[PDB]
Design a protein around this ligand. Structure first.
Ligand SMILES: CCCCCCCCCCCCCC(=O)SCCNC(=O)CCNC(=O)[C@H](O)C(C)(C)COP(=O)(O)OP(=O)(O)OC[C@H]1O[C@@H](n2cnc3c(N)ncnc32)[C@H](O)[C@@H]1OP(=O)(O)O
Ligand SMILES: Cc1nn(C)c(C)c1NS(=O)(=O)c1c(Cl)cc(Br)cc1Cl
Ligand SMILES: [Cl-]
Length: 411
């Protein structure tokens, strides 16, 4: 039973989602004028607050709420610690809508109690290729193509209720208020992800992890040791050697992305992402925002030869707090972001990502098996983890797809 989710315009079971053949809306059509003008009611001791996520002190308040109360692993050993600069980056892309950043404060002392954030995304989310084939067989091409045009929707992230307020049904109220604010701007779909199972994913992908500092990852119990390593005199020296990386990039012509690369990077990325069923469409402004290097936040390198950008990769940083180990404060993770290879094998491109990350002090490189990430797992010594990232839409029927048909990277 889902007392809140059963009231919302999402498919309600796996069986229902298995039956979906075409993309399109779930809810009755509505207009802006049908949506309440006034914020959703909340208890008198609380208030809605729209932080200013370019104002250092408002970003710091959200930063502390998430530092202390956002996602943990299942054994409460790690908690994300998104930085203030990452939150400004992630929450304020070009043409962001300040009103889609929604917080609850205690009215008395203005203590931040809860948050949810929406940002605009232009997403291709029409009927997937395998379903378009079926539709053709059956003379239903028109229906299947109806919602092919990329749509200006909301991407939700950073839903967080303070630990002391858990299981009080506040998260439904935050969801309904963000829904309201987004529908008042004439947007009626959202995309979101979660590491938990909710009604009802259109795709799910396992996490994968590439050890860059194995001694630390073992110390903090992120990683362990294959029992096979016991057959050795010295399990840990073997482990270090197994994961060792070059000290410098191997692709000649690799260098950091610069602003003048934006149009070439836009072209090679958009050519590559068009091959997947679900994927974002980025303007030059959005390429600049999401890909130009920002210290401590996003790292992006291009391969340039004959003065042409022919490949690139990016990764972003999320440290996690190491909750139980006295000797390390943080686990410094690099996450595979967007990339495109046209001149070299993808494994050869992504090897230099691992090199760069290691050289910069990262402990592990994480990814979900979206894009073509499965194509370099074994050669680059990524291992599958225990996490699974599920992809969802709000108000959008969508057939089940493999995660290798998803090109949207979630921050
Ligand atoms: C058109 C525009 C649409 C805009 C909106 C689009 C939809 C966006 C949807 C949000 C996308 C977020 C994407 C991310 O940010 S995923 C990251 C989620 N955040 C965390 O995991 C941080 C740690 N945990 C918390 O802060 C709290 O435990 C949260 C806030 C998660 C729940 O708080 P609490 O534990 O205090 O519970 P409650 O009594 O208030 O509420 C219980 C209800 O909440 C449902 N629940 C639990 N977890 C999630 C979850 N991850 N997404 C959606 N629903 C969730 C649960 O099934 C139940 O409903 P029902 O089972 O009774 O029916
Ligand atoms: C390093 C780390 N920080 N946090 C908050 C979690 C859950 C981890 N572990 S993890 O391996 O990288 C991981 C991550 Cl990033 C995301 C999910 Br969903 C599940 C897991 Cl288990
Ligand atoms: Cl793991």
């Amino acid at each position: 039973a889902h007392a809140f989710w059963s009231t919302q315009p999402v498919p309600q079971t796996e069986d229902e989602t298995e039956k979906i053949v075409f993309a399109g809306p779930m809810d009755e059509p509505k207009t802006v004028a049908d949506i309440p003008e006034e914020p959703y009611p909340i208890a008198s001791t609380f208030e809605w607050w729209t932080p200013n996520m370019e104002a250092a002190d408002d970003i710091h308040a959200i930063y502390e709420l998430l530092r202390d109360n956002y996602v943990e692993d299942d054994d409460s050993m790690f908690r994300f610690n998104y930085s203030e600069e990452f939150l400004q980056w992630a929450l304020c892309p070009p043409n962001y809508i300040p009103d889609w950043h929604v917080a609850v404060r205690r009215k008395a002392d203005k203590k931040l109690l809860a948050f949810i954030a929406g940002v605009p995304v232009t997403l291709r989310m029409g009927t997937p290729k395998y379903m378009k084939v079926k539709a053709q067989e059956k003379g239903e091409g028109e229906e299947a193509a109806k919602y092919d045009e990329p749509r200006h929707i909301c991407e939700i992230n950073f839903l967080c209720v303070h630990k002391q307020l858990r299981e009080k049904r506040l998260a439904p109220i935050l969801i309904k208020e963000a829904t309201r604010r987004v529908n008042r701007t004439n947007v009626w779909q959202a995309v979101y992800t979660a590491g938990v199972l909710l009604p009802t994913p259109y795709a799910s992908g396992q996490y994968f992890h590439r050890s860059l500092n194995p001694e630390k990852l073992v110390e903090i119990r992120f990683s362990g040791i294959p029992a096979q390593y016991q057959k050795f005199q010295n399990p840990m020296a073997m482990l270090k050697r197994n994961y060792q990386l070059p000290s410098a990039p191997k692709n000649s012509g690799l260098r950091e992305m610069k602003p003048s690369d934006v149009p070439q990077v836009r072209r090679i990325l958009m050519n590559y992402l068009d091959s997947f069923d679900v994927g974002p469409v980025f303007s030059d402004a959005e390429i600049s925002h999401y890909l130009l290097p920002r210290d401590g936040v996003v790292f992006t390198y291009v391969v340039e030869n004959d003065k042409k950008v022919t490949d690139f990769f990016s990764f972003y940083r999320i440290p996690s707090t190491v909750i139980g180990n006295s000797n390390y404060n943080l686990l410094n993770a690099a996450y595979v972001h967007y990339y495109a290879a046209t001149s070299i094998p993808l494994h050869q491109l992504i090897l230099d990502l691992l090199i760069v990350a290691h050289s910069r002090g990262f402990d592990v490189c994480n990814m979900v098996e979206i894009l073509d990430n499965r194509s370099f797992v074994e050669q680059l010594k990524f291992g599958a983890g225990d996490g699974h990232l599920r992809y969802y839409f709000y108000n959008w029927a969508y057939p089940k797809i493999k995660p290798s048909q998803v090109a949207l990277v979630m921050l």
